[PDB]
């Protein structure tokens, strides 16, 4: 229960970050970080190479190269380099 | 997955998404969590550290092949460059929440890395019947708190900002120095003078003081309080209406209005005719601080257009009380049309039930 939070809190930052007219409060005067927005996982950001540096994603299959009768279905996921 | 939980319909799924946690568990970057520029121990700028900052910087910097600012000497080296608090505070707004030296430097040096800052993602809501078609978007973000080392500091406080009912206390302290346009022909001053008013959206709650009898100086004091639980949001500082006709939301009321507030208030003299001597028309949501003296009762203070200055919180005051002018009920005219002494405050931002207890 901090009185200062009206001017320094997350929700005041959130509304001010959006930039809605007459709905930003006085938070605009606090030189706050504008919040970034992503439509996908942050882990998919190229800046970090998709965070696949420590382990990448691989899949196993049940198909065969010798005969056409085997079904190349997906088995499961493997993590590694 | 998101679903529509009505009472009058089936909760069909609104959105679908799948998340791979592995990328967050072993990521050295730390960009996976919200990373605010400002340092604090609580709130949106709160510090998050499983271990003492000198150990986290050491381990983090080993992962990124950089040199941690382990020194606290006159010239601290970070990545072979001069590092200090003075060079951090410079170029920034002063921080009332700045804490311990080791932890604040740890946050601020981490900000020198190419990591994602505090953010809120807006993710697509894909239907199970239409997996590639969005039926809306949702704002959120995800923070990780590994127990592999110590116990990372707390999650950010997102205590929701929804509909509020501010305990406006319209307390009428007296009726004095009454200005009348309806004058007697005998030279003796008398009228059915009483005070009436209400907050916008509460027309059905219109309330008035009673009538003074056998009183020429307006002697007497009712000390009546009229409550008008208007909606508002200090985080936004936007004028809103409670008891909304927007049945579709229990959330904060929002709408666009012209930058003025108009009330429908008239004098009704039981022993004469309606005397358009004045009415009370004040904007609470963007209210200026109350006058504490009668010296403010002049033409220069009647301009609402000239006092938008107080785009500030009055919610830090134990009370907001003082004098306000009345206006002729011919619109918001810049004329003095009667005077009232009353309490008009917005306090429920932090004290909804407790603060009013000091008076009633």
UniProtKB/Swiss-Prot annotation, chain B:
User: Where is this gene product found?
Assistant: Cell membrane, Sarcolemma; Cytoplasmic vesicle membrane; Cell membrane
Q: Which domain of life is it from?
A: Eukaryota
- Known tissue expression: Expressed in skeletal muscle, myoblast, myotube and in the syncytiotrophoblast (STB) of the placenta (at protein level). Ubiquitous. Highly expressed in skeletal muscle. Also found in heart, brain, spleen, intestine, placenta and at lower levels in liver, lung, kidney and pancreas.
Q: Provide the function of this protein.
A: Key calcium ion sensor involved in the Ca(2+)-triggered synaptic vesicle-plasma membrane fusion. Plays a role in the sarcolemma repair mechanism of both skeletal muscle and cardiomyocytes that permits rapid resealing of membranes disrupted by mechanical stress.
Q: How does it assemble?
A: Interacts with CACNA1S. Interacts with ANXA1; the interaction is Ca(2+)- and injury state-dependent. Interacts with ANXA2; the interaction is Ca(2+)- and injury state-dependent. Interacts with CACNA1S and PARVB. Interacts with TRIM72/MG53; interaction is required for transport to sites of cell injury during repair patch formation. Interacts with RIPOR2; this interaction occurs during early myogenic differentiation. Interacts with CAV3 and PARVB. Interacts with AHNAK; the interaction is direct and Ca(2+)-independent. Interacts with AHNAK2; the interaction is direct and Ca(2+)-independent.
Pathological condition linked to this protein in its record: Muscular dystrophy, limb-girdle, autosomal recessive 2: An autosomal recessive degenerative myopathy characterized by weakness and atrophy starting in the proximal pelvifemoral muscles, with onset in the late teens or later, massive elevation of serum creatine kinase levels and slow progression. Scapular muscle involvement is minor and not present at onset. Upper limb girdle involvement follows some years after the onset in lower limbs. Miyoshi muscular dystrophy 1: A late-onset muscular dystrophy involving the distal lower limb musculature. It is characterized by weakness that initially affects the gastrocnemius muscle during early adulthood.
For this entry, the protein name equals: Dysferlin
Q: Which organism is it from?
A: Homo sapiens (Human)
The lineage is: Eukaryota, Metazoa, Chordata, Craniata, Vertebrata
Whole-protein coverage range: 1646 to 2005 of 2080
């Amino acid at each position: 229960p901090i009185q200062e939070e009206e001017f320094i809190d997350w929700w005041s930052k959130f509304f001010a970050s959006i930039g809605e007219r007459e709905k930003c409060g006085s938070y605009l005067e606090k030189d706050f970080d504008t919040l970034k927005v992503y439509d996908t996982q942050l882990e998919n950001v190229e800046a970090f190479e998709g965070l696949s540096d420590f382990c990448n994603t691989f899949k196993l299959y049940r198909g065969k190269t010798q005969e056409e009768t085997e079904d190349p279905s997906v088995i499961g996921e493997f993590k590694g380099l | 997955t998101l679903y529509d939980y009505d009472l009058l319909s089936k909760d069909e799924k609104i959105g679908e998404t799948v998340v791979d946690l592995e990328n967050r568990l072993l990521s050295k970057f730390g960009a996976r969590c919200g990373l605010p520029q400002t340092y604090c121990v609580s709130g949106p700028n709160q510090w998050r550290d499983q271990l003492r900052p000198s150990q986290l910087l050491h381990l983090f910097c080993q992962q990124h092949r950089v040199k941690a600012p382990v020194y606290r000497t006159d010239r601290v080296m970070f990545q072979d460059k001069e590092y200090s608090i003075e060079e951090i505070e410079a170029g920034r707004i002063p921080n009332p929440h700045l804490g311990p030296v080791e932890e604040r430097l740890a946050l601020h040096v981490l900000q020198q890395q190419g990591l994602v800052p505090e953010h809120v993602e807006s993710r697509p809501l894909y239907s199970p019947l239409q997996p590639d078609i969005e039926q809306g978007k949702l704002q959120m973000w995800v923070d990780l708190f590994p127990k592999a080392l110590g116990r990372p500091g707390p999650p950010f406080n997102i205590t929701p900002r929804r509909a509020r009912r501010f305990f406006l206390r319209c307390i009428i302290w007296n009726t004095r120095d009454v200005i009348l346009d309806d004058l007697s022909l005998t030279g003796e001053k008398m009228s059915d003078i009483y005070v009436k008013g209400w907050m916008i959206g509460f027309e059905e709650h219109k309330q008035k003081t009673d009538v003074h009898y056998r009183s020429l100086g307006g002697e007497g004091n009712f000390n009546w309080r009229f409550i008008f639980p208007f909606d508002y949001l200090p985080a936004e500082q936007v004028c809103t209406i409670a008891k909304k006709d927007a049945f579709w939301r229990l959330d904060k009321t929002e709408s666009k209005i012209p930058a003025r507030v108009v009330f429908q208030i008239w004098d009704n003299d039981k022993f004469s005719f309606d005397d358009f001597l004045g009415s009370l028309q004040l904007d609470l949501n963007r209210m200026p601080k109350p006058a504490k003296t009668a010296k403010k009762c002049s033409l220069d203070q009647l301009d609402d257009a000239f006092h938008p200055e107080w785009f500030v919180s009055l919610f830090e005051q134990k009370t907001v009380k003082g004098w306000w002018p009345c206006v002729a009920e011919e619109g918001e005219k810049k004329i003095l049309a009667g005077k009232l002494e009353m309490t008009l405050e917005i306090v429920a931002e932090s004290e909804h039930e407790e603060r009013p207890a000091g008076q009633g």
